Amino acid sequence: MREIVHIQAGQCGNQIGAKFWEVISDEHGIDPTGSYHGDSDLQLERINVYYNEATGNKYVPRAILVDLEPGTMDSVRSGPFGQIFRPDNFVFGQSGAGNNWAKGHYTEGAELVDSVLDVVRKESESCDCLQGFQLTHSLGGGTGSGMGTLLISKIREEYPDRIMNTFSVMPSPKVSDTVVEPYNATLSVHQLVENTDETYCIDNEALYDICFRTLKLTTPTYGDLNHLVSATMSGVTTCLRFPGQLNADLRKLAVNMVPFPRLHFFMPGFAPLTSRGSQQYRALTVPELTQQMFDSKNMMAACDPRHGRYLTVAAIFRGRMSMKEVDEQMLNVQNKNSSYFVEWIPNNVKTAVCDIPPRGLKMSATFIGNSTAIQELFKRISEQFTAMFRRKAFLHWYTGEGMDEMEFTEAESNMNDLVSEYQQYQDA
Protein backbone atom coordinates (compact mmCIF):
# COMPACT_ATOMS: atom_id res chain seq x y z
CA MET A 1 0.00 0.00 0.00
CA ARG A 2 2.34 2.77 -1.21
CA GLU A 3 2.44 3.47 -4.96
CA ILE A 4 -0.56 4.23 -7.17
CA VAL A 5 -0.60 3.78 -10.93
CA HIS A 6 -2.65 6.40 -12.74
CA ILE A 7 -4.27 5.86 -16.13
CA GLN A 8 -6.29 8.14 -18.38
CA ALA A 9 -8.28 6.95 -21.40
CA GLY A 10 -9.73 8.90 -24.32
CA GLN A 11 -10.53 12.58 -24.75
CA CYS A 12 -12.16 13.37 -21.43
CA GLY A 13 -9.85 11.01 -19.57
CA ASN A 14 -6.69 12.63 -20.88
CA GLN A 15 -7.92 16.22 -20.54
CA ILE A 16 -8.87 15.82 -16.88
CA GLY A 17 -5.95 13.47 -16.25
CA ALA A 18 -3.69 16.23 -17.53
CA LYS A 19 -5.41 18.94 -15.49
CA PHE A 20 -5.29 16.71 -12.41
CA TRP A 21 -1.51 16.34 -12.80
CA GLU A 22 -1.11 20.06 -13.47
CA VAL A 23 -2.86 20.80 -10.20
CA ILE A 24 -1.21 18.36 -7.79
CA SER A 25 2.20 19.04 -9.35
CA ASP A 26 1.77 22.66 -8.31
CA GLU A 27 0.73 21.50 -4.84
CA HIS A 28 3.74 19.20 -4.46
CA GLY A 29 6.04 21.84 -5.92
CA ILE A 30 6.96 19.93 -9.08
CA ASP A 31 7.67 21.93 -12.23
CA PRO A 32 6.87 20.91 -15.85
CA THR A 33 10.42 19.57 -16.31
CA GLY A 34 10.00 17.56 -13.10
CA SER A 35 12.34 19.34 -10.68
CA TYR A 36 11.25 20.28 -7.16
CA HIS A 37 11.05 23.95 -6.18
CA GLY A 38 8.71 24.21 -3.19
CA ASP A 39 8.90 25.53 0.37
CA SER A 40 7.29 23.10 2.84
CA ASP A 41 8.61 19.52 3.16
CA LEU A 42 5.10 18.14 3.54
CA GLN A 43 5.22 18.47 -0.24
CA LEU A 44 7.76 15.64 -0.62
CA GLU A 45 6.76 13.28 2.19
CA ARG A 46 4.38 11.05 0.20
CA ILE A 47 5.49 12.25 -3.22
CA ASN A 48 6.33 8.63 -4.02
CA VAL A 49 2.61 7.84 -4.08
CA TYR A 50 1.92 9.36 -7.51
CA TYR A 51 5.44 10.11 -8.86
CA ASN A 52 8.56 8.07 -9.62
CA GLU A 53 12.12 9.32 -9.09
CA ALA A 54 14.94 9.48 -11.64
CA THR A 55 18.53 10.63 -12.09
CA GLY A 56 18.95 14.29 -11.16
CA ASN A 57 16.19 13.54 -8.63
CA LYS A 58 13.58 14.57 -11.20
CA TYR A 59 9.99 13.54 -10.49
CA VAL A 60 8.08 11.63 -13.19
CA PRO A 61 4.32 10.97 -12.78
CA ARG A 62 3.27 7.33 -12.50
CA ALA A 63 0.86 7.89 -15.36
CA ILE A 64 -0.15 5.97 -18.48
CA LEU A 65 -1.85 7.96 -21.25
CA VAL A 66 -4.19 5.94 -23.48
CA ASP A 67 -6.18 6.80 -26.62
CA LEU A 68 -7.34 5.33 -29.95
CA GLU A 69 -6.61 8.55 -31.83
CA PRO A 70 -3.48 10.71 -31.45
CA GLY A 71 -5.46 13.94 -31.07
CA THR A 72 -5.77 14.73 -27.37
CA MET A 73 -2.40 13.19 -26.52
CA ASP A 74 -0.51 15.25 -29.09
CA SER A 75 -2.29 18.22 -27.51
CA VAL A 76 -1.40 17.06 -23.99
CA ARG A 77 2.24 16.46 -24.94
CA SER A 78 2.40 20.05 -26.18
CA GLY A 79 0.20 20.93 -23.22
CA PRO A 80 1.73 22.80 -20.27
CA PHE A 81 3.23 19.87 -18.36
CA GLY A 82 3.44 17.87 -21.59
CA GLN A 83 7.13 16.99 -21.39
CA ILE A 84 6.74 15.87 -17.73
CA PHE A 85 5.26 12.51 -18.64
CA ARG A 86 7.31 9.43 -19.40
CA PRO A 87 7.56 9.54 -23.21
CA ASP A 88 7.20 5.75 -23.43
CA ASN A 89 3.96 5.91 -21.41
CA PHE A 90 2.14 7.45 -24.37
CA VAL A 91 0.20 4.55 -25.94
CA PHE A 92 -2.07 5.53 -28.85
CA GLY A 93 -3.72 4.07 -31.94
CA GLN A 94 -4.97 5.93 -35.04
CA SER A 95 -8.35 4.42 -35.96
CA GLY A 96 -10.40 6.13 -33.24
CA ALA A 97 -13.39 4.60 -31.43
CA GLY A 98 -16.05 6.89 -32.93
CA ASN A 99 -17.86 7.27 -29.60
CA ASN A 100 -18.56 3.53 -29.84
CA TRP A 101 -18.28 1.33 -26.73
CA ALA A 102 -18.10 -1.79 -28.91
CA LYS A 103 -15.17 -0.33 -30.87
CA GLY A 104 -13.49 0.55 -27.59
CA HIS A 105 -14.15 -2.66 -25.68
CA TYR A 106 -14.17 -5.41 -28.31
CA THR A 107 -12.51 -4.53 -31.65
CA GLU A 108 -10.46 -1.36 -32.12
CA GLY A 109 -9.55 -1.39 -28.43
CA ALA A 110 -8.71 -5.07 -28.18
CA GLU A 111 -6.20 -4.43 -30.97
CA LEU A 112 -4.41 -2.02 -28.58
CA VAL A 113 -5.12 -3.19 -25.01
CA ASP A 114 -2.11 -5.54 -24.73
CA SER A 115 0.35 -2.76 -25.52
CA VAL A 116 -1.09 -0.63 -22.71
CA LEU A 117 -0.90 -3.42 -20.14
CA ASP A 118 2.81 -3.72 -20.97
CA VAL A 119 3.38 -0.17 -19.70
CA VAL A 120 1.16 -0.93 -16.69
CA ARG A 121 3.30 -3.96 -15.85
CA LYS A 122 6.53 -1.98 -16.22
CA GLU A 123 5.26 0.60 -13.73
CA SER A 124 3.91 -2.01 -11.31
CA GLU A 125 7.32 -3.69 -11.02
CA SER A 126 8.93 -0.36 -10.12
CA CYS A 127 6.53 -0.45 -7.15
CA ASP A 128 7.87 -1.33 -3.70
CA CYS A 129 4.26 -1.88 -2.66
CA LEU A 130 1.36 -1.25 -5.05
CA GLN A 131 -2.07 -0.23 -3.73
CA GLY A 132 -3.95 -0.27 -6.98
CA PHE A 133 -4.98 1.94 -9.86
CA GLN A 134 -6.93 5.13 -10.39
CA LEU A 135 -8.48 5.58 -13.83
CA THR A 136 -9.84 8.78 -15.28
CA HIS A 137 -12.27 8.55 -18.21
CA SER A 138 -15.70 9.46 -19.52
CA LEU A 139 -18.48 6.88 -19.71
CA GLY A 140 -20.12 8.53 -22.71
CA GLY A 141 -17.58 8.17 -25.51
CA GLY A 142 -15.95 5.02 -26.84
CA THR A 143 -12.27 4.92 -25.91
CA GLY A 144 -12.47 5.90 -22.25
CA SER A 145 -15.81 4.13 -21.80
CA GLY A 146 -15.28 0.93 -23.79
CA MET A 147 -11.51 0.49 -23.77
CA GLY A 148 -11.43 1.81 -20.21
CA THR A 149 -13.76 -0.83 -18.79
CA LEU A 150 -11.81 -3.44 -20.76
CA LEU A 151 -8.53 -2.36 -19.20
CA ILE A 152 -10.12 -2.63 -15.75
CA SER A 153 -11.46 -6.12 -16.41
CA LYS A 154 -7.98 -7.08 -17.65
CA ILE A 155 -6.11 -5.32 -14.84
CA ARG A 156 -8.37 -6.92 -12.21
CA GLU A 157 -7.16 -10.21 -13.69
CA GLU A 158 -3.45 -9.48 -13.12
CA TYR A 159 -3.97 -7.60 -9.85
CA PRO A 160 -7.19 -8.96 -8.27
CA ASP A 161 -6.02 -8.19 -4.74
CA ARG A 162 -5.20 -4.57 -5.63
CA ILE A 163 -7.72 -1.74 -5.36
CA MET A 164 -9.43 -0.37 -8.47
CA ASN A 165 -10.40 3.30 -8.27
CA THR A 166 -12.06 5.47 -10.94
CA PHE A 167 -12.91 9.06 -11.72
CA SER A 168 -15.79 8.46 -14.11
CA VAL A 169 -17.47 11.32 -15.96
CA MET A 170 -21.19 10.54 -16.38
CA PRO A 171 -22.75 11.88 -19.63
CA SER A 172 -25.49 14.50 -19.88
CA PRO A 173 -27.52 15.86 -22.82
CA LYS A 174 -26.89 19.32 -21.33
CA VAL A 175 -23.27 18.95 -22.52
CA SER A 176 -23.25 16.34 -25.34
CA ASP A 177 -25.62 15.93 -28.28
CA THR A 178 -24.28 12.48 -29.24
CA VAL A 179 -27.35 10.24 -29.07
CA VAL A 180 -25.62 6.96 -28.20
CA GLU A 181 -23.94 8.11 -24.97
CA PRO A 182 -26.64 6.47 -22.81
CA TYR A 183 -25.72 3.16 -24.47
CA ASN A 184 -22.02 3.67 -23.76
CA ALA A 185 -22.74 4.63 -20.15
CA THR A 186 -25.06 1.75 -19.24
CA LEU A 187 -22.58 -0.77 -20.64
CA SER A 188 -19.80 0.85 -18.63
CA VAL A 189 -21.76 0.95 -15.36
CA HIS A 190 -22.26 -2.85 -15.53
CA GLN A 191 -18.48 -3.15 -15.67
CA LEU A 192 -17.86 -0.67 -12.86
CA VAL A 193 -20.31 -2.37 -10.42
CA GLU A 194 -18.41 -5.60 -10.89
CA ASN A 195 -14.76 -4.52 -11.18
CA THR A 196 -14.08 -1.33 -9.19
CA ASP A 197 -13.76 -0.81 -5.45
CA GLU A 198 -14.28 2.96 -5.60
CA THR A 199 -15.84 5.17 -8.29
CA TYR A 200 -16.13 8.95 -8.07
CA CYS A 201 -19.32 9.86 -9.96
CA ILE A 202 -18.37 13.07 -11.78
CA ASP A 203 -21.58 14.20 -13.49
CA ASN A 204 -21.42 16.56 -16.46
CA GLU A 205 -25.01 17.52 -15.74
CA ALA A 206 -23.88 18.81 -12.34
CA LEU A 207 -20.72 20.43 -13.69
CA TYR A 208 -22.67 22.32 -16.34
CA ASP A 209 -25.42 23.41 -13.95
CA ILE A 210 -22.76 24.53 -11.45
CA CYS A 211 -20.92 26.50 -14.14
CA PHE A 212 -24.06 28.15 -15.47
CA ARG A 213 -26.14 28.79 -12.35
CA THR A 214 -23.73 29.35 -9.48
CA LEU A 215 -20.64 30.60 -11.34
CA LYS A 216 -22.86 32.53 -13.78
CA LEU A 217 -21.04 31.36 -16.92
CA THR A 218 -23.38 31.69 -19.87
CA THR A 219 -21.21 29.73 -22.30
CA PRO A 220 -19.46 27.08 -20.14
CA THR A 221 -16.40 25.47 -21.76
CA TYR A 222 -14.67 22.15 -21.08
CA GLY A 223 -11.93 24.08 -19.31
CA ASP A 224 -14.61 25.45 -16.99
CA LEU A 225 -16.08 22.00 -16.40
CA ASN A 226 -12.61 20.58 -15.82
CA HIS A 227 -11.53 23.27 -13.40
CA LEU A 228 -14.25 21.84 -11.15
CA VAL A 229 -13.04 18.27 -11.72
CA SER A 230 -9.44 19.28 -11.13
CA ALA A 231 -10.44 20.83 -7.80
CA THR A 232 -12.46 17.78 -6.76
CA MET A 233 -9.67 15.38 -7.74
CA SER A 234 -7.10 17.36 -5.74
CA GLY A 235 -9.33 17.39 -2.70
CA VAL A 236 -10.50 13.78 -2.85
CA THR A 237 -6.93 12.51 -3.15
CA THR A 238 -5.54 14.94 -0.57
CA CYS A 239 -5.92 12.41 2.23
CA LEU A 240 -3.77 10.21 -0.07
CA ARG A 241 -1.11 12.73 -1.10
CA PHE A 242 -0.12 14.36 2.19
CA PRO A 243 0.48 13.00 5.70
CA GLY A 244 -2.86 12.25 7.34
CA GLN A 245 -4.69 9.84 9.63
CA LEU A 246 -7.97 9.06 7.89
CA ASN A 247 -8.60 7.34 4.53
CA ALA A 248 -4.86 7.59 3.89
CA ASP A 249 -4.77 4.81 1.31
CA LEU A 250 -7.20 3.39 -1.23
CA ARG A 251 -7.95 0.19 0.68
CA LYS A 252 -8.68 1.97 3.93
CA LEU A 253 -10.82 4.54 2.13
CA ALA A 254 -12.74 1.70 0.51
CA VAL A 255 -13.25 -0.05 3.86
CA ASN A 256 -14.61 3.15 5.42
CA MET A 257 -16.71 4.19 2.44
CA VAL A 258 -18.03 0.89 1.05
CA PRO A 259 -20.48 -1.03 3.26
CA PHE A 260 -21.46 -3.35 0.38
CA PRO A 261 -19.26 -4.49 -2.53
CA ARG A 262 -21.48 -3.16 -5.32
CA LEU A 263 -22.48 0.20 -3.79
CA HIS A 264 -19.15 2.00 -4.29
CA PHE A 265 -20.33 5.02 -6.27
CA PHE A 266 -19.32 8.17 -4.45
CA MET A 267 -20.90 11.61 -4.58
CA PRO A 268 -18.19 14.28 -4.53
CA GLY A 269 -18.75 17.81 -3.28
CA PHE A 270 -16.43 20.80 -3.03
CA ALA A 271 -16.21 24.27 -1.52
CA PRO A 272 -15.68 27.08 -2.14
CA LEU A 273 -16.89 26.84 -5.73
CA THR A 274 -14.48 28.71 -7.94
CA SER A 275 -14.21 29.62 -11.61
CA ARG A 276 -10.83 30.38 -13.15
CA GLY A 277 -11.90 34.02 -13.34
CA SER A 278 -13.48 34.24 -9.88
CA GLN A 279 -11.45 36.38 -7.51
CA GLN A 280 -11.92 34.61 -4.17
CA TYR A 281 -10.28 37.31 -2.07
CA ARG A 282 -12.52 36.58 0.92
CA ALA A 283 -11.65 33.20 2.44
CA LEU A 284 -14.70 31.43 3.87
CA THR A 285 -15.43 30.68 7.51
CA VAL A 286 -15.35 27.06 8.72
CA PRO A 287 -19.15 27.19 9.15
CA GLU A 288 -19.44 28.31 5.51
CA LEU A 289 -17.26 25.53 4.13
CA THR A 290 -19.56 23.10 5.94
CA GLN A 291 -23.04 24.40 5.05
CA GLN A 292 -21.93 24.46 1.41
CA MET A 293 -20.05 21.17 1.09
CA PHE A 294 -23.31 19.48 2.20
CA ASP A 295 -25.35 21.76 -0.04
CA SER A 296 -26.67 20.12 -3.19
CA LYS A 297 -25.36 23.13 -5.17
CA ASN A 298 -21.82 21.94 -4.40
CA MET A 299 -22.41 18.29 -5.28
CA MET A 300 -20.58 17.19 -8.45
CA ALA A 301 -23.07 14.35 -9.06
CA ALA A 302 -26.40 16.14 -9.65
CA CYS A 303 -28.36 14.24 -7.04
CA ASP A 304 -30.43 15.64 -4.20
CA PRO A 305 -28.87 14.13 -1.07
CA ARG A 306 -32.10 14.91 0.79
CA HIS A 307 -33.82 12.26 -1.38
CA GLY A 308 -31.66 9.52 0.09
CA ARG A 309 -29.51 8.75 3.09
CA TYR A 310 -25.76 8.88 3.64
CA LEU A 311 -24.28 5.43 4.17
CA THR A 312 -20.86 6.93 4.79
CA VAL A 313 -19.18 10.32 4.52
CA ALA A 314 -15.61 11.47 4.30
CA ALA A 315 -14.95 15.19 4.69
CA ILE A 316 -11.56 16.73 3.98
CA PHE A 317 -10.59 20.25 5.07
CA ARG A 318 -7.52 22.10 3.79
CA GLY A 319 -5.57 25.18 4.86
CA ARG A 320 -4.66 26.64 8.24
CA MET A 321 -7.71 26.73 10.50
CA SER A 322 -9.20 25.86 13.88
CA MET A 323 -9.27 22.05 13.97
CA LYS A 324 -11.38 22.51 17.09
CA GLU A 325 -14.01 24.43 15.11
CA VAL A 326 -13.90 21.93 12.26
CA ASP A 327 -15.12 19.20 14.62
CA GLU A 328 -17.97 21.30 16.04
CA GLN A 329 -19.36 22.29 12.65
CA MET A 330 -18.91 18.74 11.40
CA LEU A 331 -20.64 17.37 14.49
CA ASN A 332 -23.28 20.08 13.95
CA VAL A 333 -24.37 18.89 10.49
CA GLN A 334 -24.58 15.27 11.65
CA ASN A 335 -26.74 16.35 14.59
CA LYS A 336 -28.85 18.88 12.68
CA ASN A 337 -29.55 16.70 9.63
CA SER A 338 -29.39 13.36 11.47
CA SER A 339 -32.38 11.95 9.58
CA TYR A 340 -30.29 12.01 6.40
CA PHE A 341 -27.67 9.65 7.84
CA VAL A 342 -28.48 5.96 8.22
CA GLU A 343 -28.77 4.95 11.86
CA TRP A 344 -27.40 1.43 11.37
CA ILE A 345 -23.90 2.72 10.60
CA PRO A 346 -22.76 4.63 13.72
CA ASN A 347 -20.39 7.55 13.23
CA ASN A 348 -20.45 7.16 9.46
CA VAL A 349 -19.00 10.65 9.02
CA LYS A 350 -15.22 10.82 9.31
CA THR A 351 -13.05 13.91 8.96
CA ALA A 352 -9.47 14.79 8.15
CA VAL A 353 -7.62 18.10 8.13
CA CYS A 354 -4.60 18.88 5.96
CA ASP A 355 -2.63 22.09 6.54
CA ILE A 356 -1.57 22.75 2.94
CA PRO A 357 -4.46 24.43 1.09
CA PRO A 358 -5.25 24.12 -2.65
CA ARG A 359 -3.73 26.51 -5.20
CA GLY A 360 -5.35 29.94 -4.92
CA LEU A 361 -7.44 29.36 -1.78
CA LYS A 362 -6.77 29.70 1.94
CA MET A 363 -9.69 27.49 2.98
CA SER A 364 -11.15 24.55 1.06
CA ALA A 365 -13.50 21.67 1.80
CA THR A 366 -13.97 18.47 -0.19
CA PHE A 367 -16.89 16.09 0.25
CA ILE A 368 -17.03 12.35 -0.37
CA GLY A 369 -20.46 10.86 0.27
CA ASN A 370 -21.79 7.37 -0.37
CA SER A 371 -25.39 8.58 -0.59
CA THR A 372 -28.21 6.32 -1.74
CA ALA A 373 -29.45 9.33 -3.71
CA ILE A 374 -26.74 8.45 -6.24
CA GLN A 375 -29.41 6.17 -7.76
CA GLU A 376 -31.05 9.25 -9.30
CA LEU A 377 -28.02 9.52 -11.56
CA PHE A 378 -28.32 5.87 -12.62
CA LYS A 379 -32.08 6.35 -12.98
CA ARG A 380 -31.45 9.27 -15.32
CA ILE A 381 -29.20 7.26 -17.63
CA SER A 382 -31.55 4.26 -17.41
CA GLU A 383 -34.37 6.36 -18.87
CA GLN A 384 -32.28 7.96 -21.63
CA PHE A 385 -31.26 4.37 -22.46
CA THR A 386 -34.67 2.66 -22.60
CA ALA A 387 -36.09 5.53 -24.65
CA MET A 388 -33.92 4.25 -27.52
CA PHE A 389 -33.53 0.53 -26.74
CA ARG A 390 -37.27 -0.20 -26.72
CA ARG A 391 -37.13 0.69 -30.41
CA LYS A 392 -33.72 -0.98 -30.76
CA ALA A 393 -32.48 2.36 -32.15
CA PHE A 394 -28.84 2.94 -33.20
CA LEU A 395 -27.98 -0.63 -32.22
CA HIS A 396 -26.55 -1.36 -35.67
CA TRP A 397 -23.40 0.58 -34.79
CA TYR A 398 -22.89 -1.95 -31.99
CA THR A 399 -24.13 -5.18 -33.60
CA GLY A 400 -21.94 -4.26 -36.56
CA GLU A 401 -18.90 -4.65 -34.30
CA GLY A 402 -20.06 -8.02 -33.02
CA MET A 403 -22.31 -7.23 -30.06
CA ASP A 404 -25.78 -8.67 -29.51
CA GLU A 405 -29.04 -7.23 -28.17
CA MET A 406 -28.81 -9.65 -25.25
CA GLU A 407 -25.61 -8.03 -24.00
CA PHE A 408 -27.50 -4.73 -23.84
CA THR A 409 -30.46 -6.30 -22.01
CA GLU A 410 -28.13 -7.65 -19.32
CA ALA A 411 -26.37 -4.30 -18.79
CA GLU A 412 -29.78 -2.66 -18.65
CA SER A 413 -30.82 -5.35 -16.18
CA ASN A 414 -27.69 -5.17 -14.01
CA MET A 415 -27.98 -1.40 -13.59
CA ASN A 416 -31.66 -1.61 -12.68
CA ASP A 417 -30.58 -4.06 -10.00
CA LEU A 418 -28.00 -1.50 -8.82
CA VAL A 419 -30.69 1.17 -8.46
CA SER A 420 -32.95 -1.15 -6.51
CA GLU A 421 -30.07 -2.14 -4.22
CA TYR A 422 -29.37 1.53 -3.49
CA GLN A 423 -33.09 1.77 -2.64
CA GLN A 424 -33.10 -1.30 -0.40
CA TYR A 425 -30.75 0.39 2.08
CA GLN A 426 -32.35 3.85 1.80
CA ASP A 427 -35.39 2.44 3.64
CA ALA A 428 -33.52 0.79 6.50
Binding site: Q15, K19, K174, Y222, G223, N226
Partner: peptide, 5 residues
Protein backbone atom coordinates in the same frame (compact mmCIF):
# COMPACT_ATOMS: atom_id res chain seq x y z
CA UNK B 1 -25.28 22.78 -27.27
CA UNK B 2 -21.84 24.07 -28.49
CA UNK B 3 -19.44 23.39 -25.37
CA UNK B 4 -13.02 23.56 -26.05
CA UNK B 5 -9.83 23.11 -22.44
Amino acid sequence: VVXXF
